């Protein structure tokens, strides 16, 4: 129809999705109302300006932003001086999603830099001379796999890496993030991610890990940082993704998990919140929505007959609308929500989430949903490692040619 | 001694007491990537930190230097490790270090390293006497600070300080009944104390929650808590729940109540209830209402549930293909 | 105003 609005967030009924505070105001409802009011303005902008809406992913702008950042950053990134391998990964993956080639000059320079970040003891640090840590170790490995050259792969010292992982392993099944460091589910994921890709998983490396992770699932259905803590999309993604790598997703109550994550998508905004009663944030477009492809695979592996064969179990269209209309910075790069400033972290995950929302795939079945101009379609991302599915296959195949350290 | 923000602050390369030390420039290689253009102060402090770390100089001046490096980037875990090495090696007064960490957390409460550092201090001293109060102050500024709640659970659990936490939880639920962190803490306290098996406790909690649901019917936290504390034993195990929820339909409806109804129906069909078919249709009707009208953002989920229920509960579900 | 994850 001519009166019909193709964009879900601009339809008249959508107005009914606004927050109902039952005339009981608290810090929570107040903060939620502020966001929705700001988001409504964005949605209404076309109408009030008397222009026909057009959702365009600003590829050109994002590319310039990334291309430059990969080489040089302002002092605004002093707070990430201990996370440079992450900057490599976030940027390289964003370029990958945007289908932008990685010049071999760049690739080799990235390899050399990550090599300087590698510890003599194993693992990677946040920068040259810094002690190894599981977070930058995970980012370093992902960056090298995105490059996927023989040179990149050879940077990783597999024997030391495994030794490093063992030095962090705890008796209860958990891992420290680094020597004398903290413990939470992130370490399980970082360890399982780098260990599986580089083929260094021994018979006892992850003993008790699946059980420890399962202990982090709480009454909410989601997973917390440590047993007892509130469920959060970041920790839930780490927990499930790690379990998928260990082939132990079944240790979890997948049904309560599914119900929890699907409830994390905001009815009005379209994007996801990180935990119940908090605010929408573009980076959760991945940490949260990324769980659906994982759950789909797990449920299907159990022979679930009710699983859709064309869509993930979340509003794909609404997520794309939120990201495209509310998370792009006009100067390039993406962000948390309107009012927040861009950064490479959100640029990486907003695009990763957009890709997830555009590409559905369950074995032979394949269905895409690209909101806005067709040029918006991105390269697909692997729901476990968050790098190109082809890069995962390529990397794993390569390392399977090597023998698990110590045989 | 000399604060990083002091108007008379001087770069380390201009300090006499550091003249014997040659700074150590960062080794980024020939053609750097993601190279950060550090400010003068930042690079100067870290060039000297790299020097003391390299020499493993365990001195009072190195100790003071870590305070500045941390101030410039509290997320630098390497500096924190060296600081802890210096705390022990130099036999530093840990209560003084406690005063120090209490101040740093106040200014950067969302940082991982600061909280882990405080935990280590408490462990070393074996003194949790200042924790609940300190955490309470942080939570008074951000009632949902994840690190704060996690540290609070650790302290309470390790030192068995359960006695007043439920009271603390009631206070915050009063302030904001929508604080999911407080509902999580409530479940944390009860689980580790009385447990939810004692019928008097479970009864008390469910009454409290339904009462909170009445006051704020659209508050998703109360609903998730209600479901969370009953779903393990099975929702169908509580026959009056369904009826009572249907009574709130009129003046307290929400996609949350409709969703709960579906969960109850789902468990009933799972424990082969009476009127197998009557319950199924009631459920599929709600699943459709939710997917088409009441909760469309979750249409793909609700259609999945509708399908799942149909798949294993329709009158023809157990009937052979030949029939 | 930014997200901290490590
Ligand atoms: C592979 C890794 C390192 C995954 C971690 C991903 C995330 C997103 C972790 C979040 C950890 C956390 C709960 C930090 C607490 O501060 N965060 C917030 O308060 C943000 P929100 O309000 O959205 O919960
Ligand atoms: Zn974010």
């Amino acid at each position: 129809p001519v009166w019909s609005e193709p964009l879900y967030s601009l339809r008249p009924e959508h107005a009914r999705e606004r927050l109902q505070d039952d005339s009981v105001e608290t810090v929570t409802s107040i903060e939620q109302a502020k966001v929705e009011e700001k988001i409504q303005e964005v949605f209404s902008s076309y109408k009030f300006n008397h222009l026909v809406p057009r959702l365009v992913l600003q590829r050109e702008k994002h590319f310039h932003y990334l291309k430059r950042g990969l080489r040089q950053l302002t002092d605004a990134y002093e707070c990430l001086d201990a996370s440079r391998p992450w900057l490599c990964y976030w940027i390289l993956h964003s370029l990958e999603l945007l289908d932008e080639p990685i010049p071999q000059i760049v690739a080799t320079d990235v390899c050399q830099f990550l090599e300087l970040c590698q510890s003599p003891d194993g693992g990677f640090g946040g920068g040259p001379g810094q002690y190894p840590h599981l977070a930058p170790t995970y980012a370093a490995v992902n960056a090298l796999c995105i490059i996927g050259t023989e040179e990149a792969y050879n940077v990783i010292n597999r024997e030391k890496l495994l030794q490093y992982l063992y030095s962090l392993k705890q008796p209860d099944g958990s891992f420290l993030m680094h020597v004398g460091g903290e413990v939470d589910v992130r370490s399980a994921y970082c360890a399982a991610s780098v260990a599986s890709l580089t083929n260094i998983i021994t018979p006892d490396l992850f003993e008790g890990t699946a059980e420890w992770i399962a202990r982090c699932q709480n009454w909410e259905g989601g997973i917390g940082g440590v047993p007892g803590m509130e469920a959060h999309g970041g920790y839930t993604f780490c927990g499930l993704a790690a379990l998928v790598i260990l082939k132990k997703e079944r240790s979890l109550n997948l049904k309560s998990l599914l119900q929890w994550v699907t409830s994390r998508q905001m009815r009005f905004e379209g994007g996801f919140q990180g935990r119940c009663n908090k605010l929408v944030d573009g980076c959760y477009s991945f940490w949260q929505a990324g769980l659906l492809p994982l759950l789909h695979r797990a449920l299907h592996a159990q022979g679930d007959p009710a699983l859709s064969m064309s869509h993930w179990m979340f509003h794909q269209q609404a997520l794309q609308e939120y990201i495209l209309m509310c998370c792009q910075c006009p100067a390039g790069g993406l962000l948390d929500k309107p009012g927040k400033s861009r950064d490479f972290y959100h640029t990486c995950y907003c695009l990763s989430g957009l890709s997830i929302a555009q590409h559905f795939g369950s074995g032979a079945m394949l269905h895409d949903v690209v909101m806005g101009v067709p040029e918006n379609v991105l390269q697909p991302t692997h729901p476990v490692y968050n790098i190109g599915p082809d890069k995962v296959i390529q990397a794993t195949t390569h390392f399977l040619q090597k023998p698990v350290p110590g045989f | 001694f000399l604060s990083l923000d002091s108007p008379t602050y001087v770069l380390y390369r201009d300090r006499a007491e550091w003249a014997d030390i040659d700074p150590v420039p960062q080794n980024d290689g020939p053609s750097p990537v993601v190279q950060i253009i550090y400010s003068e102060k930042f690079r100067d402090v870290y060039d000297y930190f790299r020097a003391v770390l390299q020499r493993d100089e365990r001195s009072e001046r190195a100790f003071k230097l870590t305070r500045d490096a941390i101030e410039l980037n509290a997320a630098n875990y390497t500096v924190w490790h060296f600081r802890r090495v210096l705390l022990r090696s130099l036999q530093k007064d840990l209560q003084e270090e406690m005063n120090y960490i209490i101040a740093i957390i106040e200014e950067q409460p969302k940082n991982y390293q600061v909280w882990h550092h405080r935990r280590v201090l408490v462990e070393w001293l074996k003194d949790p006497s200042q924790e609940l109060e300190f955490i309470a102050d942080i939570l008074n500024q951000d009632a949902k600070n994840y690190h704060a709640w996690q540290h609070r659970q650790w302290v309470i659990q390790e030192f068995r300080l359960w006695d007043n936490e439920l009271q603390y939880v009631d206070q915050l639920l009063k302030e904001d009944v929508r604080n999911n962190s407080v509902w999580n803490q409530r479940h944390f306290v009860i689980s580790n104390t009385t447990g939810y098996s004692d019928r008097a406790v479970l009864e008390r909690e469910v009454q409290y929650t339904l009462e909170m649901i009445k006051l704020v019917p659209h508050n998703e936290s109360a609903w998730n808590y209600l479901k969370g504390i009953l779903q393990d034993r099975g929702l169908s195990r509580y026959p009056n729940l369904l009826n009572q929820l249907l009574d709130l339909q009129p003046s307290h409806s929400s996609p949350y109540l409709i969703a709960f109804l579906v969960d109850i129906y789902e468990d009933m069909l799972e424990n082969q209830c009476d009127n197998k078919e009557d319950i199924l249709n009631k459920a599929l009707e709600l699943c459709e209402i939710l997917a088409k009208e009441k909760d469309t953002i979750r249409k793909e989920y609700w259609r999945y549930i509708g399908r799942s229920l149909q798949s294993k509960h329709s009158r023809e579900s157990d009937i052979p293909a030949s029939v | 105003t930014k997200c901290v994850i490590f």
Side-chain angles (χ1 to χ4, degrees), chain A, chain B, chain C residues 1 3-6:
Chain A
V2 53
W3 52 271
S4 294
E5 177 62 62
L7 296 185
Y8 181 82
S9 309
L10 312 196
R11 295 168 191 168
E13 324 79 279
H14 191 254
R16 296 206 275 284
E17 299 300 83
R18 290 295 288 283
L19 178 69
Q20 282 173 260
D21 71 337
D22 310 305
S23 291
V24 176
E25 315 201 318
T26 62
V27 171
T28 300
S29 63
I30 291 175
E31 291 310 299
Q32 180 52 28
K34 289 174 183 172
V35 174
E36 299 189 352
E37 196 208 64
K38 187 67 197 67
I39 299 298
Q40 179 58 74
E41 280 172 46
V42 172
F43 291 160
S44 295
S45 70
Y46 307 85
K47 166 190 181 181
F48 296 172
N49 289 307
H50 312 297
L51 304 174
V52 167
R54 61 179 182 184
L55 308 193
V56 179
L57 177 64
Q58 301 301 322
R59 292 174 166 282
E60 183 66 346
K61 286 302 193 299
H62 303 316
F63 176 65
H64 169 274
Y65 175 59
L66 299 162
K67 172 188 170 62
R68 180 170 181 169
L70 181 55
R71 214 86 217 191
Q72 196 180 81
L73 305 156
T74 66
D75 59 14
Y77 282 80
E78 278 179 352
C79 62
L80 288 167
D81 181 46
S83 305
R84 292 175 67 203
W86 279 100
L87 290 162
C88 292
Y89 164 65
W90 293 327
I91 295 170
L92 288 177
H93 181 57
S94 294
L95 288 173
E96 168 180 48
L97 288 175
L98 290 173
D99 199 25
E100 296 292 3
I102 308 306
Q104 293 309 298
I105 286 183
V106 178
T108 191
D109 282 352
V110 170
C111 290
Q112 291 179 59
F113 173 64
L114 292 186
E115 213 175 305
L116 291 178
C117 294
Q118 198 170 200
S119 170
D121 299 348
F124 298 78
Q130 291 175 45
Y131 289 136
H133 185 291
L134 277 175
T137 292
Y138 159 85
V141 175
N142 266 5
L144 294 174
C145 288
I146 289 177
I147 291 169
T149 65
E150 183 76 11
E151 171 183 32
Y153 297 147
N154 296 329
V155 165
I156 306 171
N157 180 333
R158 299 170 64 264
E159 298 74 14
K160 287 299 181 178
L161 178 52
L162 179 60
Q163 268 176 48
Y164 181 59
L165 298 188
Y166 269 122
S167 77
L168 304 175
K169 180 68 180 299
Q170 300 306 289
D172 66 1
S174 67
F175 287 76
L176 306 177
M177 280 305 295
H178 68 102
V179 175
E182 74 276 14
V183 174
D184 60 62
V185 72
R186 289 172 306 151
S187 71
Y189 172 66
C190 291
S193 182
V194 301
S196 65
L197 293 170
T198 63
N199 184 45
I200 57 176
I201 300 185
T202 63
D204 65 327
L205 180 56
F206 293 108
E207 282 300 82
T209 302
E211 288 69 33
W212 186 81
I213 296 177
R215 290 214 287 129
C216 297
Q217 173 167 47
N218 78 348
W219 56 279
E220 290 177 280
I223 299 176
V226 297
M229 277 304 289
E230 170 177 31
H232 197 282
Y235 291 131
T236 299
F237 172 86
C238 289
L240 184 56
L243 283 177
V244 168
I245 291 174
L246 300 176
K247 310 168 189 296
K248 297 278 183 62
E249 323 87 77
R250 295 199 62 194
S251 306
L252 301 168
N253 178 333
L254 296 178
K255 160 167 175 49
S256 63
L257 178 42
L258 174 65
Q259 182 148 51
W260 177 82
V261 63
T262 58
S263 295
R264 298 285 70 71
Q265 180 159 32
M266 313 301 277
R267 62 182 65 260
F268 183 69
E269 304 92 299
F272 287 73
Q273 63 185 174
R275 33 180 165 153
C276 182
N277 272 313
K278 288 219 74 183
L279 312 167
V280 68
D281 180 333
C283 65
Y284 296 134
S285 297
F286 176 78
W287 307 118
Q288 293 285 35
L291 286 166
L292 290 158
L294 294 181
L295 284 168
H296 186 97
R297 171 184 167 179
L299 291 175
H300 176 284
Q302 287 184 175
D304 202 315
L307 290 182
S308 170
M309 276 299 100
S310 62
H311 297 79
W312 300 122
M313 272 174 278
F314 75 89
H315 208 298
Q316 282 164 260
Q317 168 182 30
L319 182 58
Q320 288 180 54
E321 278 171 37
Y322 175 66
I323 299 183
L324 292 168
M325 290 187 270
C326 305
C327 301
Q328 300 188 84
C329 168
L334 289 89
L335 43 104
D336 178 337
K337 61 173 68 62
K340 291 298 180 69
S341 52
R342 66 185 192 175
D343 60 59
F344 298 101
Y345 167 72
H346 288 83
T347 292
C348 175
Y349 297 104
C350 281
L351 293 173
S352 295
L354 181 58
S355 189
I356 299 295
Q358 301 177 322
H359 308 301
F360 167 84
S362 185
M365 317 299 94
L366 294 169
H367 178 62
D368 287 355
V369 174
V370 181
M371 293 306 287
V373 302
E375 294 66 53
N376 294 340
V377 64
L378 304 165
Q379 288 293 288
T381 193
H382 192 296
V384 168
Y385 304 90
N386 198 26
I387 61 173
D390 55 305
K391 297 295 163 55
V392 168
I393 296 175
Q394 192 174 119
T396 58
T397 292
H398 170 80
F399 289 110
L400 278 172
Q401 304 191 314
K402 307 290 189 299
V404 178
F407 294 18
Chain B
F1 253 3
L2 198 64
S3 175
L4 194 66
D5 287 343
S6 173
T8 56
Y9 175 83
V10 175
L11 299 175
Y12 279 73
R13 66 164 175 258
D14 295 325
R15 309 195 182 189
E17 72 267 42
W18 283 91
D20 62 287
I21 290 289
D22 269 359
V24 179
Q26 173 160 276
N27 181 33
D28 272 345
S31 38
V33 287
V34 298
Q35 167 174 251
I36 307 171
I37 306 306
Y38 314 106
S39 65
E40 270 270 71
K41 292 173 62 182
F42 193 103
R43 181 190 298 298
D44 165 74
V45 157
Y46 273 86
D47 284 344
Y48 276 85
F49 169 68
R50 277 184 277 280
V52 291
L53 181 63
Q54 191 165 288
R55 285 193 177 194
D56 190 19
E57 168 180 320
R58 304 185 184 179
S59 62
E60 185 52 49
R61 62 172 184 177
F63 180 65
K64 291 193 172 73
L65 175 56
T66 61
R67 173 197 267 277
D68 288 331
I70 281 168
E71 186 106 318
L72 292 170
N73 178 21
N76 190 310
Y77 58 87
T78 293
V79 174
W80 282 104
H81 179 268
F82 191 59
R83 187 180 177 83
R84 285 198 281 281
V85 171
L86 296 180
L87 282 173
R88 300 301 293 291
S89 178
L90 299 173
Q91 293 291 66
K92 301 302 296 183
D93 179 303
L94 302 183
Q95 266 312 319
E96 198 182 11
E97 182 65 353
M98 270 292 320
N99 298 347
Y100 167 71
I101 201 64
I102 291 109
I104 300 301
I105 290 168
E106 285 287 352
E107 44 179 290
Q108 305 193 65
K110 303 189 68 184
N111 168 293
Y112 279 84
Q113 296 65 45
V114 291
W115 286 101
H116 179 58
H117 189 69
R118 189 185 182 93
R119 187 208 260 221
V120 169
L121 291 183
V122 171
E123 285 173 352
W124 284 352
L125 289 167
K126 292 177 172 170
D127 179 11
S129 65
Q130 304 179 52
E131 303 313 288
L132 303 183
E133 198 184 317
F134 166 69
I135 298 170
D137 183 63
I138 295 296
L139 290 176
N140 187 233
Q141 300 164 64
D142 178 350
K144 304 182 176 184
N145 186 302
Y146 203 99
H147 300 281
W149 283 111
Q150 187 173 318
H151 181 70
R152 206 181 172 87
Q153 295 194 344
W154 173 75
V155 170
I156 288 176
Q157 194 149 49
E158 290 301 303
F159 299 83
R160 308 181 203 295
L161 305 177
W162 306 97
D163 293 5
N164 296 290
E165 194 65 349
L166 190 55
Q167 179 181 308
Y168 183 63
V169 165
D170 288 329
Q171 184 202 309
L172 298 192
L173 280 178
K174 255 273 185 175
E175 282 159 31
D176 185 353
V177 75
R178 297 188 175 90
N179 190 334
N180 197 64
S181 295
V182 180
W183 283 94
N184 179 75
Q185 190 70 347
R186 188 188 190 72
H187 184 289
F188 173 72
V189 173
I190 297 175
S191 289
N192 291 280
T193 49
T194 64
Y196 288 88
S197 288
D198 172 55
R199 293 173 185 169
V201 176
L202 182 61
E203 181 170 56
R204 181 198 62 189
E205 290 303 297
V206 172
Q207 289 286 38
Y208 177 71
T209 310
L210 290 174
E211 179 51 24
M212 293 300 97
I213 287 181
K214 285 175 58 58
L215 280 47
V216 192
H218 292 83
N219 169 22
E220 183 175 359
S221 284
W223 286 99
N224 294 340
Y225 183 66
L226 177 62
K227 174 171 180 286
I229 64 174
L230 298 173
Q231 60 178 50
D232 278 331
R233 296 296 278 150
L235 293 186
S236 64
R237 175 189 169 75
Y238 312 88
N240 292 332
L241 192 46
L242 170 54
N243 306 301
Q244 287 178 46
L245 283 187
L246 293 170
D247 293 316
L248 293 179
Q249 274 281 37
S251 52
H252 306 76
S253 186
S254 66
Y256 301 125
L257 182 167
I258 308 300
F260 205 100
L261 293 185
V262 184
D263 290 311
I264 295 180
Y265 289 151
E266 182 171 51
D267 189 54
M268 287 180 72
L269 305 175
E270 221 64 283
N271 292 293
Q272 283 148 355
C273 55
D274 300 306
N275 309 301
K276 192 71 176 295
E277 187 177 65
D278 171 49
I279 297 298
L280 185 37
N281 296 320
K282 274 183 162 61
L284 301 175
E285 162 189 341
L286 296 184
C287 285
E288 197 51 37
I289 285 180
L290 294 162
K292 291 275 70 172
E293 170 192 359
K294 246 74 175 178
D295 193 48
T296 64
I297 195 68
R298 272 166 280 288
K299 63 181 179 177
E300 282 305 312
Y301 171 73
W302 287 128
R303 291 195 187 305
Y304 162 76
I305 293 296
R307 249 139 51 212
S308 288
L309 293 176
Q310 252 293 77
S311 174
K312 59 180 184 296
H313 299 311
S314 63
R315 70 160 59 185
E316 296 296 305
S317 292
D318 79 298
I319 304 299
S322 52
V323 169
Chain C
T1 55
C3 285
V4 176
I5 66 169
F6 48 62

